[PDB]
Amino acid sequence: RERMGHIELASPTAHIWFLKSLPSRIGLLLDMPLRDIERVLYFESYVVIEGGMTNLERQQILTEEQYLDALEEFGDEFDAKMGAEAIQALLKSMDLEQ
Amino acid sequence: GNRRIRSVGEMAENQFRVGLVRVERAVKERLSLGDLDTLMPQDMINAKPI
Amino acid sequence: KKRWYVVQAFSGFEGRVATSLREHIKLHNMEDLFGEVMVPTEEVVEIRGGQRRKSERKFFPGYVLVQMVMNDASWHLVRSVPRVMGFIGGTSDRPAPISDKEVDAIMNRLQQ
Amino acid sequence: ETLRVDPTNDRLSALVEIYRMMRPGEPPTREAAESLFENLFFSEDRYDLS
RNA sequence: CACAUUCCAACCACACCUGGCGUGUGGC
DNA sequence: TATCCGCTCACAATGCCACACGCGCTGCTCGGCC
DNA sequence: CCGAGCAGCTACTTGTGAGCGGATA
């Protein structure tokens, strides 16, 4: 009645409750419109991470063309991941007090 | 005058057509390879959907 | 250029969708726009033994990636044939094909 | 008013716009889009006014 | 020598059953 | 650039009781240190 | 080849509240 198990998902996934709350938690926390987060979640666009010296904004989203045309500008420091893993990296790389 | 009444016959004919469109798609995809002198008009039709 | 785009079909009907799209290509005589099916199910993995040593030409994900030239008519043709539920690719509806590295990778999987 | 709010003027852009309105994305040419508009309302297989 | 258990006259233990879910109908 | 207006989506809509019934066929895919 | 479990074959509700553009000063 009480012993439980678990599943080790190979790819970390998002929790649909925190994404479809209206207002969703990530939609307000990550100061990003829910449409773009849904775009990143279903793997039809890219979102950049760790901008730094690149010309792009670190939280900006990109499409596939917007990624291939901009990859030639920077390929070593500019990285745009594309899956609940991206928003997980966004969460882990976010400060609370600042 | 604006509300129409349908009997068992009309609903039965409708469902017969719903099954017939599935069997139609089936016989159309099966006819994509059937040629002359290789099949009777019996094997391409199945009883299942209708 | 004949690029290698990826297409997903109904679960199990991968080879059937492959032959259907081949018959559709041979139908509208559009061979100059497409290549071949390139069915990646080269997984001859089998189980042998007492009177049972047959092979299994299966055991692969449901992907029937086809070499073809991306175009409006080509896309509408490969989508007009039924059982083509999946057209993978991050895009509105016009995706980017696979690169030559994965081409050689799946070629090695074909040869092994 | 419906004319001055009409974004498209010719017949071909009307067809592709109504296709985009029916099916999300999938932007065809004018001749490819017309198939939908001619098959949904004027084809006897998908319109069966008795 | 030590740790740890000991398999058989009535009988105690070896009992007792489908709302998972939906649909249809009827009543208050 | 703020801010009211128009379009779009989530959520709700007794309670009980009684009876009856249901989820198929062909096809496809995965199952295995003696 | 054998067995076991699982997949393909929508619109008369209306109202309320909240959110997302959007267009007007």
Swiss-Prot record, chain D:
Oligomeric state and partners?
A: The RNAP catalytic core consists of 2 alpha, 1 beta, 1 beta' and 1 omega subunit. When a sigma factor is associated with the core the holoenzyme is formed, which can initiate transcription.
- The shown chain, on whole-protein numbering, covers 349 to 398 of 1342
**Function comment:** DNA-dependent RNA polymerase catalyzes the transcription of DNA into RNA using the four ribonucleoside triphosphates as substrates.
The molecule here is called DNA-directed RNA polymerase subunit beta
Q: Look up the domain of life of the source.
A: Bacteria
So which residues are the signal peptide here?
none
Source species of the chain: Escherichia coli O157:H7
Q: Which family does it belong to?
A: Belongs to the RNA polymerase beta chain family.
